[PDB]
Amino acid sequence: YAPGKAIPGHGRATNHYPELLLNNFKTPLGLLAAKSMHILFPSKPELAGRQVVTLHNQRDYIFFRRHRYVFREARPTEKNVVGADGKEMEGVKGIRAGLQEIGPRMTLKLRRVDKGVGRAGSEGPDAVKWEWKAKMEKKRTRFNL
Amino acid sequence: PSEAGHRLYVKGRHLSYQRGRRNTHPKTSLIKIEGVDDTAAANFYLGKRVAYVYRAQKEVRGTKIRVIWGKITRPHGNSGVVRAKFTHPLPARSFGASVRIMLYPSSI
Amino acid sequence: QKWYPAEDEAQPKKVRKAVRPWTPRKSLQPGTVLILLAGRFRGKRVVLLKCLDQGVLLVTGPFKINGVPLRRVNARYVIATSVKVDLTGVDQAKIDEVAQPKYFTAASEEAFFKQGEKPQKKPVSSTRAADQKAIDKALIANIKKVDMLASYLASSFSLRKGDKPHLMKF
Amino acid sequence: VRYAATEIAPTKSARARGSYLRVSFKNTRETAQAINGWKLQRALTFLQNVIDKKEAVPMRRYAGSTGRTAQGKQWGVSRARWPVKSAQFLIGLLKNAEANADAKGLDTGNLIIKHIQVNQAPKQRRPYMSNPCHIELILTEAEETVQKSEAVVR
Amino acid sequence: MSSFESVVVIDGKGHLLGRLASIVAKQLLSGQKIVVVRCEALNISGEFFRAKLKYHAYLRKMTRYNPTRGGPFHFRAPSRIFYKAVRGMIPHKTARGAAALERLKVFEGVPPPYDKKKKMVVPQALRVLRLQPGRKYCTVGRLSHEVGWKYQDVVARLEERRKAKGAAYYERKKLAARQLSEAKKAAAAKVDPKVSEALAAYGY
Amino acid sequence: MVAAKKHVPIVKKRTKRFMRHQSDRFKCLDSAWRKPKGIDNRVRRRFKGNLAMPSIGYGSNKKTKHMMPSGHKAFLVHNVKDVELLLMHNRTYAAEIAHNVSSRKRIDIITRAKQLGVKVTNAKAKVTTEV
RNA sequence: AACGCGACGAUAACCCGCACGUAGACGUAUAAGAAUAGGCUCCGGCCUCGUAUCCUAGCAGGCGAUUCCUCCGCCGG
RNA sequence: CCCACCCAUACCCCGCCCUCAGGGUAGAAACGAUGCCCUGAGGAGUAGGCGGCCGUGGAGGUCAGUGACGAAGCCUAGGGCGUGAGCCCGGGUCGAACGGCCUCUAGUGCAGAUCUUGGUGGUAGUAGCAAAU
RNA sequence: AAGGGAAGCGCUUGUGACCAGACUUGCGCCCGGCGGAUCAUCCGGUGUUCUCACCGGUGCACUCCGCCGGGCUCAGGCCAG
């Protein structure tokens, strides 16, 4: 956890509704987490307030960041954003995006999802739906997301 | 508009501690109260509450004002200088500093 | 009582300290004008009504004159003035009733959702009021007899340059 | 509690390390302090001028009076020299850092040296002892400040 | 009597150097801001030849090497003489003494910012109240002039001009007193005898 | 009413440690007090303006001795057996879990002490709250 | 005076971002000069005493009148 | 000559520490009679003598002692205990053993010894390019 | 953060920075319901210090405990006047 005050080169968030970028959630558990965050955030962002809230998931490590837009032309010394497997995307040929982090840095990692309001509140035979385990995370190629 | 004063205290100066010639005792301070120059006046001002007010360059309760409290106890010498004891000894650089002597507790 | 002494907690020996009537200073008489020096009414001129126990005093402004309601004051924290306004016409039964200590003495959704909020300033009861009036009608009726006493009680005391309390005669 | 300032983004940053370099630690420290906190092109041209005997590195901490010329006016220091091997290896290391940043995909135009640290190395056991050094330098694209959208009242 | 002021202006005419300087030093340590004018009008007891002899001995006191560092700088200005006295009585090598010295200011003549201000006197240092009538005395300004002070004439003409302006100010003050007293009488002609007797009884 | 017994107020004659002479100037000298043996050492001679020496006069009151500021004496505890030893005397002693105790045994000590009314100085060592 | 001062000439204002708000005020009011074996003055008289003068009332000082042309403050000549 | 005033670890009152001395304490105590309670006195200290207590390596007994869900070690602008040597805990690192008490044992406690070994500084990027390298 | 020809140390505040987090905060009585029990001169079994225990089984007439929902009281840690 890191506050914006400590973050160098930061800024405040504005009252505008920001849009959420939920990246690389593939397993059903990842979709569940992504939809929970989508419910937490508003459906229609105020695109006039150019703010992005991004949760990027890689290797079960959910990364939270908050930035804001500047869509600007590419400077002569800059690059054109190259594509992954299909480099040099077509259509955005001279424009970049400026990002200035205006939100706290935290990393979240899911450990438990329950049916009701906690273990005290989950009562049926399926009281617990998922619990993170070191036996599950033993192999580095096993990602629960 | 009132255009008047709000002062309910008597001015004084923290001057030095109770000291000999080469040995000081910060636990007790010497105060010169304005207008008093005799042991009778010091006796009147005996047993009184005392406040030292200073700035802090940081707000703790929404203000930078900090107050150290104490009491005038018994007179010093014959010139009306009085002796005071505080909860915490006055800093040291307050030698010659403005201090407030309250009018309570009152025997009038 | 219910529980036998659980540990070696020793009872205190008998303490030979009795409580005896407090003797106020001679300057404190019913009707004396007092000078509040501390509290949120510091520097304010009020009128004494009755001497309570353990150094406490009951005073009023009166409210319509300066703005001080029926309140308690510490004798050591208040200064007595030689001027004494006559107290004829004030109800002594009402004085006793307001001098009784209880007068000034006294988990749900609302609590949980008010948690952390600064409490609102509650208004004055009609009983604390209406008793303020039951006393002040007669008290100010007394005030208009004495010349300039109303302005004296209305203004707030302060110290001027050269004013020396050890020589000043209050 | 208190939070220390977080590190700059690794994909906005570039790192370079050179260990066990056979150049005098004092000279490398002086050159690093001279070039610290500057523009990448400015630092490269400065070091090239140092090699070309054109601009002088001022000595502040490890200062031995060798030269008192007019080249020390721009620093306000009366002691300035020309560390050749220092300039050359540091040029190599910032070129390596620039290549690393280009590989990472940073804007070559705005690399600035935030950090350059020179430490001592294990002494070359040959009494005449050599003093090798370690040099680590961290570069970033210039920090970007962007517009606000006007706050909407509601 | 034991009064605290924002700043105290002391007219230096007729004051003994040592006594006035000691009182000023004690006031500075107490924290009272003090400014002294007419340091050229200050007075020193004894005889003028004794004063010249001692200050010439002070001039004789010099360092052996170049008199630029650590050497006694002989300041021939009367204000600096008063400053030397107060500095000798002040713990000048400590922070408290430095604060007292900064609280003290001394001048020659009376610049306008202090000529348009009130000047206090110290009875314990007055030459008239302190020295025996038969005793002799000397002037700091005369000593400074004969030892090397260069601006005795400058302060002379500036002081004379100040005298002329002060005389004009007093004349206008006389006129103000005229009007004030006449207003007193004219208003007292219809001053509500009841309130007038009230003031008489209470003593104002 | 869950606190220590009525006790004489805790008065500490000296709060600052006694420092070894010249330990400030030499790092090889640890700050632990060592009584000097020099025949002319100023600290041993007890001149004014020198480091004081430890003394049974500085020794503290027996009634307030070994007492924590809350008013309990620290009891080093390793298990629920130690907690049950503190059973009868919790108003006199407060549990202090040993550093080498594992997480579950720490939890058991905390739970038993809470059930038993025994204050624990380190109840937040290797544990966290779960809802 | 390289940590004393003055006069003068010529300048550095905008765009974006972000960071914070007393070596001792509380009425911190008061200008003749000059002498002290003299001085002040209104020309009547006055002087041991600044123990004086000025100012000093209103929610940390409101609202409306009553009623006063008295002071205070800001800008222009 | 007279009056008041200022302060030493000096004298007076009180609290606390320890030592000393005196007294009390069993058909047992509301605290290990090597225990508990009460009272009075004293308190510098070289050579020297006596007691107690802290700490280290190992051994017997014991704590159904701690521990890979973390032993020992180390670092730490943290919380305590003891007058003190020292002890306990919190945070980080770390990975395989370790501790409290009763005794037994000794290669058991460092600032000096132009001390030993090893490592590292100022001199200094200086003297000088000299053998070595 | 500090530095006008030494530093370093002692007693005592003050300022700034960082860190910690105070008493561990409850018993008692009175009502209405519910359930368990040295309750029942209840039945049965087991082990025993042979007179004390522990179980299995009925109930709630009395007695005692709790749990629930009410009601009242008291006690508390530190610091000031």
Automatic annotation (TrEMBL), chain B:
Keywords from UniProt, A to Z, are: Ribonucleoprotein, Ribosomal protein
Q: Does the keyword Transmembrane apply?
A: no
Q: Which GO terms describe its biological process?
A: translation
Q: Which GO terms describe its cellular component?
A: ribonucleoprotein complex; ribosome
Classification via Gene3D superfamilies = translation elongation factor selb, chain A, domain 4
State if Plastid is listed as a keyword: no
Sample GO molecular function, one term: structural constituent of ribosome
One Pfam family recorded for the sequence: Ribosomal_L35Ae
Task: Provide the family line.
Answer: Belongs to the eukaryotic ribosomal protein eL33 family.
Q: What is this protein called?
A: 60S ribosomal protein l33-like protein
TrEMBL record, chain C:
Any matching Pfam family:
Ribosomal_L6e
Keyword Ribosomal protein on this protein? yes
Q: Which UniProt keywords apply?
A: Ribonucleoprotein, Ribosomal protein
Among the GO molecular function terms of this UniProt record, one is: structural constituent of ribosome
Q: Which SUPFAM superfamilies match?
A: Translation proteins SH3-like domain (SSF50104)
InterPro entries (alphabetical): 60S_ribosomal_eL6, Rib_uL2_dom2, Ribosomal_eL6_CS, Ribosomal_eL6_KOW, Translation_prot_SH3-like_sf
Q: What is one cellular component GO term in this UniProt entry?
A: cytosolic large ribosomal subunit
GO biological process terms, alphabetically, are: cytoplasmic translation; ribosomal large subunit assembly
CDD domains on file: KOW_RPL6
Q: Where is the composition biased (Basic and acidic residues)?
A: 110-120
Q: Which Gene3D superfamilies match?
A: 2.30.30.30
Q: Where is this region: Disordered?
A: 110-129
Return the similarity comment: Belongs to the eukaryotic ribosomal protein eL6 family.
UniProt-listed PANTHER family: 60S RIBOSOMAL PROTEIN L6, LARGE RIBOSOMAL SUBUNIT PROTEIN EL6
According to UniProt, the name of this protein is: 60S ribosomal protein L6
Supply the source organism for this entry. Answer: Chaetomium thermophilum (strain DSM 1495 / CBS 144.50 / IMI 039719) (Thermochaetoides thermophila)
From TrEMBL, chain E:
Q: Family assignment?
A: Belongs to the universal ribosomal protein uL13 family.
Q: Which UniProt keywords apply?
A: Ribonucleoprotein, Ribosomal protein
Read off the CDD domains from this record: Ribosomal_L13
Q: Which Pfam families does this chain map to?
A: Ribosomal_L13
Keyword Ribosomal protein part of the UniProt annotation: yes
Q: Protein name, please? A: 60S ribosomal protein L16-like protein
One GO BP: negative regulation of translation
What InterPro entries does the annotation carry? Ribosomal_uL13 (IPR005822), Ribosomal_uL13_CS (IPR023563), Ribosomal_uL13_euk/arc (IPR005755), Ribosomal_uL13_sf (IPR036899)
Instruction: Work out whether the entry's keyword set contains Cell inner membrane.
Output: no
Q: Which GO terms describe its molecular function?
A: mRNA binding; structural constituent of ribosome
Q: Name one GO cellular component term.
A: cytosolic large ribosomal subunit
Instruction: Tell me the superkingdom of the source.
Output: Eukaryota
Organism field: Chaetomium thermophilum (strain DSM 1495 / CBS 144.50 / IMI 039719)
| Function recorded in the entry | Component of the ribosome, a large ribonucleoprotein complex responsible for the synthesis of proteins in the cell. The small ribosomal subunit (SSU) binds messenger RNAs (mRNAs) and translates the encoded message by selecting cognate aminoacyl-transfer RNA (tRNA) molecules. The large subunit (LSU) contains the ribosomal catalytic site termed the peptidyl transferase center (PTC), which catalyzes the formation of peptide bonds, thereby polymerizing the amino acids delivered by tRNAs into a polypeptide chain.
UniProtKB/TrEMBL annotation, chain F:
For this chain, one GO molecular function annotation is: structural constituent of ribosome
Q: Which domain of life is it from?
A: Eukaryota
Q: Where does Mg(2+) bind?
A: D40
SUPFAM superfamilies associated with the record: Ribosomal protein L32e (SSF52042)
Q: What is this protein called?
A: 60S ribosomal protein L32-like protein
Family according to the record: Belongs to the eukaryotic ribosomal protein eL32 family.
Q: Which UniProt keywords apply?
A: Metal-binding, Ribonucleoprotein, Ribosomal protein
A GO CC annotation recorded here is: cytosolic large ribosomal subunit
InterPro entries linked: Ribosomal_eL32, Ribosomal_eL32_sf
Q: Please cite one Gene Ontology biological process associated with this protein.
A: translation
Q: A single Pfam family, by name?
A: Ribosomal_L32e
